[PDB]
Design an enzyme around this catalytic site. Structure first.
Site, PDB file in Angstrom:
ATOM      1  N   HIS A  62      -1.434  -8.034  18.010  1.00  0.00           N
ATOM      2  CA  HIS A  62      -1.956  -6.936  17.180  1.00  0.00           C
ATOM      3  C   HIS A  62      -3.089  -7.443  16.246  1.00  0.00           C
ATOM      4  CE1 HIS A  62       2.031  -7.768  15.431  1.00  0.00           C
ATOM      5  NE2 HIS A  62       1.424  -7.754  14.248  1.00  0.00           N
ATOM      6  N   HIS A  92      -4.566 -12.220   7.706  1.00  0.00           N
ATOM      7  CA  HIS A  92      -5.044 -11.646   8.925  1.00  0.00           C
ATOM      8  C   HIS A  92      -6.100 -10.593   8.603  1.00  0.00           C
ATOM      9  CE1 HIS A  92      -1.927  -8.905   7.613  1.00  0.00           C
ATOM     10  NE2 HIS A  92      -2.724  -7.934   8.088  1.00  0.00           N
ATOM     11  N   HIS A  94      -8.033  -6.684  10.040  1.00  0.00           N
ATOM     12  CA  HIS A  94      -8.120  -5.519  10.872  1.00  0.00           C
ATOM     13  C   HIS A  94      -9.618  -5.222  11.053  1.00  0.00           C
ATOM     14  CE1 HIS A  94      -3.842  -4.622  10.095  1.00  0.00           C
ATOM     15  NE2 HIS A  94      -4.104  -5.239   8.944  1.00  0.00           N
ATOM     16  N   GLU A 104      -8.767  -0.467   6.924  1.00  0.00           N
ATOM     17  CA  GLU A 104      -7.569   0.369   6.789  1.00  0.00           C
ATOM     18  C   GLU A 104      -7.690   1.220   5.558  1.00  0.00           C
ATOM     19  OE1 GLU A 104      -4.098  -2.276   7.635  1.00  0.00           O
ATOM     20  OE2 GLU A 104      -4.316  -1.160   9.518  1.00  0.00           O
ATOM     21  N   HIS A 117      -6.397  -9.136   4.833  1.00  0.00           N
ATOM     22  CA  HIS A 117      -5.107  -9.015   4.150  1.00  0.00           C
ATOM     23  C   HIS A 117      -4.486 -10.396   3.924  1.00  0.00           C
ATOM     24  CE1 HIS A 117      -4.610  -4.656   5.653  1.00  0.00           C
ATOM     25  NE2 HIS A 117      -5.417  -4.760   4.594  1.00  0.00           N
ATOM     26  N   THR A 196       1.170  -1.926   6.828  1.00  0.00           N
ATOM     27  CA  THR A 196       0.366  -0.988   7.601  1.00  0.00           C
ATOM     28  C   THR A 196       0.613  -1.060   9.113  1.00  0.00           C
ATOM     29  OG1 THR A 196      -1.524  -2.434   7.926  1.00  0.00           O
ATOM     30  CG2 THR A 196      -1.536  -1.133   5.880  1.00  0.00           C
ATOM     31  N   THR A 197       1.522  -1.904   9.527  1.00  0.00           N
ATOM     32  CA  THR A 197       1.988  -1.987  10.902  1.00  0.00           C
ATOM     33  C   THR A 197       3.481  -1.809  10.906  1.00  0.00           C
ATOM     34  OG1 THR A 197       2.209  -4.396  10.816  1.00  0.00           O
ATOM     35  CG2 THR A 197       0.176  -3.534  11.711  1.00  0.00           C
TER      36      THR A 197
HETATM   37  C1  LIG Z   1      13.187 -11.365   9.654  1.00  0.00           C
HETATM   38  O1  LIG Z   1      12.842 -10.215   8.892  1.00  0.00           O
HETATM   39  C2  LIG Z   1      11.613  -9.722   9.011  1.00  0.00           C
HETATM   40  C3  LIG Z   1      10.439 -10.423   9.209  1.00  0.00           C
HETATM   41  C4  LIG Z   1       9.234  -9.748   9.228  1.00  0.00           C
HETATM   42  C5  LIG Z   1       9.117  -8.369   9.040  1.00  0.00           C
HETATM   43  C6  LIG Z   1       7.854  -7.746   8.943  1.00  0.00           C
HETATM   44  C7  LIG Z   1       6.769  -8.377   9.800  1.00  0.00           C
HETATM   45  N1  LIG Z   1       5.440  -7.803   9.436  1.00  0.00           N
HETATM   46  C8  LIG Z   1       4.722  -8.340   8.449  1.00  0.00           C
HETATM   47  O2  LIG Z   1       5.145  -9.378   7.877  1.00  0.00           O
HETATM   48  C9  LIG Z   1       3.519  -7.730   7.995  1.00  0.00           C
HETATM   49  C10 LIG Z   1       3.029  -6.551   8.568  1.00  0.00           C
HETATM   50  C11 LIG Z   1       1.868  -5.911   8.054  1.00  0.00           C
HETATM   51  C12 LIG Z   1       1.207  -6.483   6.964  1.00  0.00           C
HETATM   52  S1  LIG Z   1      -0.191  -5.653   6.267  1.00  0.00           S
HETATM   53  N2  LIG Z   1      -1.180  -5.207   7.450  1.00  0.00           N
HETATM   54  O3  LIG Z   1       0.367  -4.466   5.591  1.00  0.00           O
HETATM   55  O4  LIG Z   1      -0.845  -6.630   5.413  1.00  0.00           O
HETATM   56  C13 LIG Z   1       1.687  -7.658   6.436  1.00  0.00           C
HETATM   57  C14 LIG Z   1       2.822  -8.287   6.945  1.00  0.00           C
HETATM   58  C15 LIG Z   1      10.297  -7.665   8.860  1.00  0.00           C
HETATM   59  C16 LIG Z   1      11.514  -8.338   8.853  1.00  0.00           C
HETATM   60  O5  LIG Z   1      12.699  -7.744   8.702  1.00  0.00           O
HETATM   61  C17 LIG Z   1      12.967  -6.740   9.686  1.00  0.00           C
HETATM   62 ZN   LIG Z   2      -2.915  -6.045   7.562  1.00  0.00          ZN
END
Ligand SMILES: COc1ccc(CCNC(=O)c2ccc(S(N)(=O)=O)cc2)cc1OC
Ligand SMILES: [Zn+2]
Length: 258
Positions: A62, A92, A94, A104, A117, A196-197
């Site tokens: 992604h 990362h 976008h 975003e 981000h 945001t994902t």
């Molecule tokens: C082991 O537990 C976890 C580990 C990771 C996650 C979330 C993974 N996604 C992100 O860390 C993440 C996604 C989007 C962003 S953003 N685009 O909002 O900066 C930043 C981080 C959720 C979890 O618990 C379900």
């Molecule tokens: Zn992001």
């Protein structure tokens, strides 16, 4: 049938597996600069990245993440709207298929070419996993990218992307200094939001810098050569990996500047 950014798996579909997609504090949002209010309660923002220890760069299908060693207090964000200390875990971007889209967040409906981000977790919760079970678990520092002059501090990232073209590829990426991705000014907007994902978790204090950084056309063109697919799968360029603005609902965006 995994989530993504296509017609049949993109942002308009995410709510079926992640009903919080239609929640009360989703991100990103449009920043109406005419309704954002200066907040004198905000403390000075402190971006303390001099001891950052990058480890690795990963194409996760992604975006690509530059990951840090967060086993000790090293690269941290504090101040501003934040209570306590937030440790940098990864950054990362976008970005778009074209220079006129990719961010975003938007600013008075303006889309930038890309958005950086820098993701941080609140050390009072011990681990990132516990932090994402809390309403103040995370802080994401968002920085807009416009196309113009090159960002010299981004080139080391650009140049490793050919080694992580496809989903699931990683490479060592030590000694990268994220200070080289910052703009001059730390003037920002802040509001409470979400990832945001998927899983879209509502854990994030967003801090969005007003001043964009400039990157060159050639730098963002290299972003656009990455692939969403894995090796030996049909090639799907990694472009337009942004979620559009979501309803502000009962939130106020605060400004650090008068
Ligand atoms: C082991 O537990 C976890 C580990 C990771 C996650 C979330 C993974 N996604 C992100 O860390 C993440 C996604 C989007 C962003 S953003 N685009 O909002 O900066 C930043 C981080 C959720 C979890 O618990 C379900
Ligand atoms: Zn992001």
């Amino acid at each position: 049938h995994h989530w993504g950014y296509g017609k049949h798996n993109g942002p308009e579909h995410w709510h079926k597996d992640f009903p919080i997609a239609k929640g009360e504090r989703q991100s990103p949002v449009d920043i109406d600069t005419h309704t954002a209010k200066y907040d004198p309660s905000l403390k000075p923002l402190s971006v303390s990245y001099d001891q950052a220890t990058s480890l690795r760069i990963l194409n996760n299908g992604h975006a690509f993440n530059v990951e840090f060693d967060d086993s000790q207090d090293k690269a941290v964000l504090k101040g501003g709207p934040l209570d306590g200390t937030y440790r940098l875990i990864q950054f990362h971007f976008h970005w778009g298929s074209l220079d006129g889209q990719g961010s975003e967040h938007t600013v008075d409906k303006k889309k930038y070419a890309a958005e950086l981000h820098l993701v941080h977790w609140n050390t009072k919760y011990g681990d990132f996993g516990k932090a994402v079970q809390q309403p103040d678990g995370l802080a994401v520092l968002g920085i807009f990218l416009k196309v113009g002059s090159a960002k010299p501090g981004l080139q080391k990232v650009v140049d490793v992307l050919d080694s992580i073209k496809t989903k699931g590829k990683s490479a060592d990426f030590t000694n990268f200094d994220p200070r080289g991705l910052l703009p001059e000014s730390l003037d920002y907007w802040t509001y409470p939001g979400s990832l945001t994902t998927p899983p879209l978790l509502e854990c994030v204090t967003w801090i969005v810098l007003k001043e964009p950084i400039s990157v060159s056309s050639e730098q963002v063109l290299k972003f656009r050569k990455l692939n969403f697919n894995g090796e030996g799968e049909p090639e799907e360029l990694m472009v337009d990996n942004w979620r559009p603005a979501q309803p502000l609902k009962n939130r106020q965006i605060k400004a650090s500047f008068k």
